[PDB]
Amino acid sequence: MTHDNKLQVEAIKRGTVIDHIPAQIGFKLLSLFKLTETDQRITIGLNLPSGEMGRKDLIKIENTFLSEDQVDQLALYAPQATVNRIDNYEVVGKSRPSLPERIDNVLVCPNSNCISHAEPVSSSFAVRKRANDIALKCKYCEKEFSHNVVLAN
């Protein structure tokens, strides 16, 4: 409680605000990381009018603080987002994501003979080589692919 509006919607009390989501990444991040599977109120702003990117997405999850590595699972998808941590209407913390060393769960090994497909295992990829462009190596078949390839299906 304090002012909302929507050009830059406002103030939840205590919780996380992931802001400056690229655009059209918001729902991907909701889906993939299952941020929705919470009983807390979530407010989401999609295709919003803002500062340098012009139109961005934003997600406010109150009463949940996610960080350290949750914030990092966002780097492949939303690398230039900020994750505001809020306590009592003030941003007591502000993180940016960084490429992790392992991305569990969210990806699919493009190698069709991989065993991972068929089984009660979570996918896992060792990550490497920042921004000149990322390689991802499957835990199981140990094949290394370009991130853009794993990321197309």
Partner: protein, 310 residues
């Protein structure tokens, strides 16, 4: 008598420009006014020693549409010949004893031309021999280029896919080289490159070709985009999959395509051309397979018939 009368259609390399244009002008007439009793009383053998449904159903419908009877077998489903040492020279010496033309597919390269040494006066038309030739697929591809582009020369033809083992791209490059001023763009994974002996033949005729690794580089200039099946056994799972399964066409890619551009594909297509391409007017792969009916009908007409009244 017409030049193809009682000729064996075994290789593209044996058909001249004039031969190719004759077949193609006859397919256009039969497509326009049909002749349903032209091969009345003829009986043709449809010998598919290796199964190929697509090709067989089209060759046989073509024979049915000119009024001929068909007898024959599909195999790799043990319809018992080759049983108890029977040579192919002996199979063909007995089959030509009672049919008027033999259509045949066989797994070994060279088999249709050997049938020729034993058939006597019964024509042998090749529907595929191993990784060597398939004239009737090139004749239908040509007919579809001609009919949609109005010409077979001065074309900008892109070939995409597995160019190293694809038997149809190798023959069509050879047929189009019969003609004038065509220009080639080959777009293939490095492991599935167009062979040197094709490139060497293009060079020696002053025909222009180039290599590109994205269709986006060449879309604007392209008249015919002949796509091909990459079979995932020609690479390993992770290779196919890797940065190489992007010789795949989607609808968005066609944005800048010329109004006349067409997408051709011998078929089956599994995923190299996405389903949304079908709704475009550039998708001509099914129409291409429909044209297989008039290219095969014209060859059967010209081969079994002395004088064709058109």
């Amino acid at each position: 008598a017409n030049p193809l009368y009682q000729k064996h259609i075994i290789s593209i390399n044996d058909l001249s420009r004039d031969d190719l244009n004759l077949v193609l002008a006859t397919a256009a007439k039969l497509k326009a006014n049909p002749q349903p009793e032209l091969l009345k009383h003829k009986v043709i053998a449809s010998c598919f020693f290796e199964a190929s449904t697509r090709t067989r159903l089209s060759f046989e419908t073509s024979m049915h549409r000119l009024g001929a009877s068909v007898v024959g077998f599909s195999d790799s489903a043990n319809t018992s010949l080759g049983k108890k040492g029977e040579t192919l020279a002996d199979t063909i010496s007995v089959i030509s004893t009672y049919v008027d033309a033999i259509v045949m597919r066989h797994p070994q390269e060279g088999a249709a031309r050997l049938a020729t040494e034993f058939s006597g006066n019964v024509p042998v038309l090749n529907a595929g021999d191993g990784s060597n030739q398939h004239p009737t697929q090139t004749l239908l591809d040509l007919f579809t280029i001609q009919e949609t582009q109005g010409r077979l020369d001065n074309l900008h033809v892109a070939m995409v896919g597995d160019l190293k083992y694809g038997r149809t791209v190798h023959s069509l490059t050879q047929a189009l080289a019969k003609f004038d001023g065509n220009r080639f763009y080959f777009i293939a994974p490095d492991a599935l490159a167009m062979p040197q002996y094709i490139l060497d033949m293009l060079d020696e005729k002053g025909i222009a070709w180039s290599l590109h690794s994205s269709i986006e580089e060449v879309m604007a200039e392209v008249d015919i985009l002949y796509m091909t099946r990459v079979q995932k056994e020609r690479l390993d799972p992770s290779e196919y999959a890797n940065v190489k399964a992007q010789f795949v066409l989607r609808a968005s890619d066609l944005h800048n395509a010329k109004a006349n551009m067409k997408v051709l594909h011998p078929l089956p297509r599994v995923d190299e051309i996405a389903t949304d391409v079908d709704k475009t007017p550039h998708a001509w792969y099914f129409q291409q397979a429909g044209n297989g009916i008039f290219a095969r009908q014209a060859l059967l007409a010209l081969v079994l018939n002395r004088d064709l009244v058109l």
